[PDB]
Amino acid sequence: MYLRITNIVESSFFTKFIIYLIVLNGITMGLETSKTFMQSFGVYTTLFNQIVITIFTIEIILRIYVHRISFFKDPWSLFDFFVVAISLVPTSSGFEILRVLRVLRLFRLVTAVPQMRKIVSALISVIPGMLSVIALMTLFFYIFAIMATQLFGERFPEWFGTLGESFYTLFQVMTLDDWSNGIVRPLMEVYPYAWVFFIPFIFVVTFVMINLVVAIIVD
């Protein structure tokens, strides 16, 4: 019976099945939004999700006594194991933040299609060489986030009242969200010189992300 179930799971049709059904829940989760549909077609939907989730649980189980060691030595499987388990945690308890986390099974659709796997890995390909740069960036912030909190955060706390408030803002500025009228002009009107912070900060921090796509296109 070991090899009967091995053919079962690894078949074209078990794939087409699970992929058809990832697609389906992914239209019903669409329609769940509709707060009218939830009156008209409400109940079909709520247990459709339980119907589909068990299938996935067994699809996960069927996969596991086949591969064994092999299964959890795959990132995409593990994430599927991770994702559908996230949904096995009950609707009650914990936080709602578990109810809405659930909808990460649509990433399952991604892992299910090998074309997505091909391209998604190209995207994760690129990351590590940037860990060099990436994790300096993550300190320039820390250093410069602190300077702000003490400098401003008395008078302008929403923005820099805090280690973490300074971060959220310095990010804000990094992306040049609405930093000009929104964030320095109002400061200078109290602390006239804080342009010696940000114009510098804006310089370092666009520079780096520029010499990021340069040295991204060498790999």
Next chain:
Amino acid sequence: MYLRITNIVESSFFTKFIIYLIVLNGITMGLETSKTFMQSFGVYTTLFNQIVITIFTIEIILRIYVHRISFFKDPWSLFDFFVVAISLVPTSSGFEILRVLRVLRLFRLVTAVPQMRKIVSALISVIPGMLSVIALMTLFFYIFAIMATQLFGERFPEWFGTLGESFYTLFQVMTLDDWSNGIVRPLMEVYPYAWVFFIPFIFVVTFVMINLVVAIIVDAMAILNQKE
């Protein structure tokens, strides 16, 4: 009669005549925008529309009698057809939008003028060299558009009321438009943990698009070498 009309079509005149009308109608359309004009020199242009449309409607039939089966298997032709024909839509009734789609006719400057046709072909070449990632986004976007509506849109109705409003808002944040003060800071006053739906939804967005583009440079770069 075929090779007689097959001569009216291909002539250096007929293209220089059809094209030079496009320009001559652009100007014309650049003046249907003051009210001043439609007052004084109004019906003047009202029917100059009606002229340059007949000139095309016929022309498409001429090429259809030349190329025929060849005509509906070229993109640039199929466009001129569609775009002329959509102008054939009637002035009265219909929909007020179809009355405004007209100045798409000014796209035949692309289609007739040769150098503009070439760039378009260049520019449309990159498309499927990305079309996986184009999808990967709308899936990702989708999984993130629900997630928004069932979190925020209860309180914050305009921004995240529906699938629709969530997507559009989630686009806004992509261009990095007003996003922090304008959309998220507000979310933080009721929901201090929204910088977890967003500072990430950011990097992911701007990791991809950067790779979407280093692709464009790469696929376009990839074609250059390796021929030795």
Next chain:
Amino acid sequence: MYLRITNIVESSFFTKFIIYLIVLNGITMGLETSKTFMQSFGVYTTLFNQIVITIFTIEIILRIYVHRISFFKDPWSLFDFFVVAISLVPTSSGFEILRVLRVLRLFRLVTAVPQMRKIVSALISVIPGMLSVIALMTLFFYIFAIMATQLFGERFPEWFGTLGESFYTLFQVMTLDDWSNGIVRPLMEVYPYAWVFFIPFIFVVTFVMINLVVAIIVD
């Protein structure tokens, strides 16, 4: 005498001398922008300006003697010409910009100095490569501008009232400057489908801009 006026001009002294006048008139006008400086030194500095032109005026007469027709067959020189053709014009009457166009002079730091010439004409040299596209956009821009203008200029005339409005507003959206909340959500208050003009327009324009750079990068 022709071959003295050739020698006076060609000297490595002459250039240094010209570049000295510019880089003074450069410093001098920084101080002209000030409010207080023109109280005190508004005597000398209104003098000094009128010399620096008188001299460059001579320089053009001589350099024309030297190269004759080769003068108005050279870009860089014509720029020196028309920039100085401006400053001559008397101080009062007509438009107030001709008295500000004065500062256009300072760009003689570029023409005069080789390696400013080179990197400037290195920039400009891609424009011929870009006609093939600027053409197309100004066709695209002009075309949406018409549609925008009829469709919205009735309820939103400060923004889409004429062509002019529509162009700048469309020029805005292209810089993703406050397009959404600023310009479009207000439009969705009255014309709900504007996300189908404004998004897609927004797509295309950036599309181009990327592929613009992906052939500037081969070129």
Next chain:
Amino acid sequence: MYLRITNIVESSFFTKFIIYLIVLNGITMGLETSKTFMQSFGVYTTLFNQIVITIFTIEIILRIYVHRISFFKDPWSLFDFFVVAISLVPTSSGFEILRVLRVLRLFRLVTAVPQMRKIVSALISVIPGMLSVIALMTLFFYIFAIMATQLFGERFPEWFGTLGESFYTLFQVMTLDDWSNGIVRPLMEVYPYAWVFFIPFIFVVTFVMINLVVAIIVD
């Protein structure tokens, strides 16, 4: 006795003793941030820092002997001398921004750890190749930065008062921060053709900003 102090300073323990101190006093200054942490355990914060500055002024006097002439001709040390010197000023009088610089030391985690040094110099490196077109633009940003002050400074004072106020603004227009509604849309009410002034400017400053980026990609 000279080569005994030259055979510890160079070792891999003396080094990891700073890099670890760095990382502790690095962690400590983010705890200062907490207002709760300053009236609970502020004592060990004041001292830990106090000891660190002892260790570091010792370290630096220790590396001066081993290195001497090799020391005061290195970037990373002239950095480290001043970056630490700053924390030794009396802390009374002067300016309170003396006291804030004290966190520029946590930059040393970059100095004293070699991968960061080669990732950091991988950016300073491609800076002498750019200081050309940093000249061309800083020229433009001046020339206009005059006109702006003298086309809109009597009435549009905040944004364009002083020469400076023209700088801080045009940069915001350059960063494309809120420019159109923020800045141009308002000027246009009083002076209508300000788009002619600004809009071109926003071609020049971004074209150059794009090609100067291409000049990075082949070199």
